[PDB]
Design a protein around this ligand. Structure first.
Ligand code: MG
Ligand code: MG
Lengths: 127, 58, 113, 117
RNA sequence: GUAGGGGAGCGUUCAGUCCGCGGAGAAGCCAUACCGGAAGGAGUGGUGGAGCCGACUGAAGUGCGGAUGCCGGCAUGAGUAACGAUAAAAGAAGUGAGAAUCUUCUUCGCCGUAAGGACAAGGGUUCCUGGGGAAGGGUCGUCCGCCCAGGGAAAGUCGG
RNA sequence: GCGAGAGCUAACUUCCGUAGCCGAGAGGGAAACAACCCAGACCAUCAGCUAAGGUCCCUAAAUGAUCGCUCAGUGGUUAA
RNA sequence: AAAGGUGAAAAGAACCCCGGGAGGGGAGUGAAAGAGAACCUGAAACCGUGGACUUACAAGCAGUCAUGGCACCUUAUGCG
């Protein structure tokens, strides 16, 4: 224990099987669709389903998924063939407001959103 | 003007009762008989180019 | 209804200039990848063309020359390919479908002689 | 000297906001609405005490005679009877006696007929 | 008990004074089943990382849901309508981390008193070469009229 | 409501007199319902007696007692 | 017009992992990265992931009073 301040130093705080693509120029709502088929499974499948799934959000999710893997494995010395998407999700980063002209003088703002795709891989096992 | 227009903001809920139908169906991948990588039934294996023999270039 | 029997997505001449354009490429290169559907359009048309070529008389050449405006390609179908299919009951052209595409999600495919 | 509202308002708000719990949607997440819901809330709260008193005696009277009539009496009668016997004077718990102790309840039943006709 | 009058108080900042508190940790934030007749107050834990409670008195830009209020942020409509002339496009080949969308070739189609060419005005470097790949380009882009660097413009008689 | 005019002794009509309530009045009753009826809410209570209204079931309480009336469903939309 | 704030001091992240990059994970500096340069605090609306209790004969200002079921019990097992 000690007290907060000593803890901060006795510990460093880490993130097992975790990666995160911050600021992917896509709509969270759009990416979620893909991140959703991949939630909770054989990180192999995830690799596989992405290769085929038609949505263009797939690349980024791909990249984050193979980065979270290249961590669980390296910085975490994990056993890859027991790895599975423990958790994944999409949060919205800033928003690229941009102005668009409209009929008869009026104007409009197109919201070009963006997303933080983060995915957490973890060794499975039954027991 | 913009003639029809909505009477009220829709619940975060209502707005979701809606989307209860937009969930992608994951492809039904098969495993290629040769290089064993997964493929799409009735198409050529993008990894070996086979479809019994090798159709597409390496 | 609409129980007809054919395809367009262009006017009346475009749909004819395409089928002619693909007919020619297919014959000039033995194989071409194309949108899945377009190959479907192409297939029968081309087979017919190989069968018209498959006569050797000037008439049959002159007819083919109506849908193959490239002198070199007509000679090929006329003298190299039509003669070769002599013994098969007009039935050769096959379509293989490949993966979906990126720019528009459209699944491409192969139509080969 | 200037004198913001700082922290003074957030709090006033959290107070109400936190009163609303299983308050459905907006009503439990938006100040204005949540708050407003609590005015009607006043109306019910206050008036419901002066009122569950009304509701409860009803539950009591209902049972008191589904036992009363279980012998051949009925609340109306039965009650005036125990009444006829200043002796008897429960009324409060009477139902319960009629719900749990049948042995007893009978007693009081017949006790009234025996002070009735 | 509405307009209205009268009474007692809660809270916010600033100021004077008292008691103090704080890096083993202030203010602010966050959670809570305690306390007070209310306004409100406290305890404990988490966050935080430096100033700060309580009490008496004094001064106030002192308390908010309303004003088609003001500024800002984020929602709904909804992944909907649109992607800006119905002059079409096809294949091959090349480059590339990735291309329907770039480059090359070969065809197709559209303009041809023009959708060709030369100036003016107006704009300025937009020109050329090599790079680039955020944002702009209603979609891709390895490309661009976009970003970076370098280069380019030459008059005794053309205009002044 | 009662007393008058105005008005077709029309109007949730209009203008005065006068009482009451709403307005500034919650509670029970009248299906629902400002003002009609009974009643004026200092706070608490799983306690009690009543008002007006009610006591087949939907809701609390006699499908009570005695002597009658109408067969119409009168009851639960008017007259010569 | 709007626009402030790394840390005491740059000691501003050598080297390795996935990525074209952006981004991130380790390592290392630092009291602290539960300060990393879209860097003091970081409320609320608003989006999302996981968990608990629920929901597919139902007419709903969205609560309130009452009871039962389920879960949990740091001002809190006897009341919640
Ligand atoms: Mg407002
Ligand atoms: Mg008459």
């Amino acid at each position: 224990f000690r007290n907060k301040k000593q803890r901060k130093q006795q510990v460093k705080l880490r993130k097992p099987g975790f990666a995160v693509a911050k600021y992917v120029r896509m709509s969270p709502r759009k990416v979620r669709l893909v991140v959703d088929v991949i939630r909770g499974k054989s990180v192999q499948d995830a690799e596989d389903l992405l290769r085929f799934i038609p949505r263009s959000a797939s690349e980024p999710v791909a990249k984050v998924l193979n980065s979270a893997k290249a961590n669980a494995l390296h910085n975490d010395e994990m056993l890859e063939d027991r790895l599975f998407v423990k958790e994944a999700y999409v949060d919205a980063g800033p928003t690229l407001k941009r102005l668009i002209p409209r009929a008869r003088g009026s104007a409009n703002i197109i919201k070009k959103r963006t997303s933080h795709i983060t995915i957490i891989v973890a060794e499975k096992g039954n027991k | 003007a913009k003639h029809p227009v909505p009477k009220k903001k829709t619940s975060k809920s209502k707005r979701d009762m809606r989307r209860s139908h937009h969930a992608l169906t994951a492809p039904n991948l098969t495993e290629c008989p040769q290089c064993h990588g997964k493929k799409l039934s009735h198409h050529i294996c993008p990894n070996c180019g086979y479809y019994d023999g090798r159709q597409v270039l390496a | 209804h609409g129980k007809a029997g054919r395809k367009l997505n262009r006017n009346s001449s475009a749909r004819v200039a395409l089928a002619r354009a693909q007919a020619t490429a297919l014959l000039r290169e033995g194989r071409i990848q194309t949108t899945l559907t377009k190959a479907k359009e192409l297939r029968p048309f081309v087979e017919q063309l190989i069968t018209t070529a498959k006569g050797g008389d000037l008439h049959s050449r002159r007819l083919v020359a109506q849908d193959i405006h490239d002198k070199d390609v007509v000679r090929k179908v006329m003298d190299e390919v039509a003669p070769k299919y002599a013994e098969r009951p007009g039935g050769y052209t096959r379509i293989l479908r490949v993966g979906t595409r990126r720019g528009d999600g459209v699944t491409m495919a192969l139509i080969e002689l | 000297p200037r004198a913001k509202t700082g922290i003074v308002r957030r709090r006033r708000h959290k107070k109400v906001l936190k009163r609303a719990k299983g308050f459905w949607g907006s009503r439990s997440k938006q100040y204005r609405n949540a708050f407003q819901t609590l005015l009607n809330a006043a109306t019910y709260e206050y008036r419901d005490r002066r009122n569950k008193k009304r509701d409860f005696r009803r539950l009591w009277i209902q049972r008191i005679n589904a036992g009363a009539r279980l012998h051949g009496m009925n609340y109306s009668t039965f009650i005036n009877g125990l009444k006829r016997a200043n002796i008897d004077l429960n009324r409060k718990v009477l139902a319960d006696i009629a719900a749990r102790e049948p042995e007893a309840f009978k007693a009081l039943v017949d006790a009234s007929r025996n002070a009735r006709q």
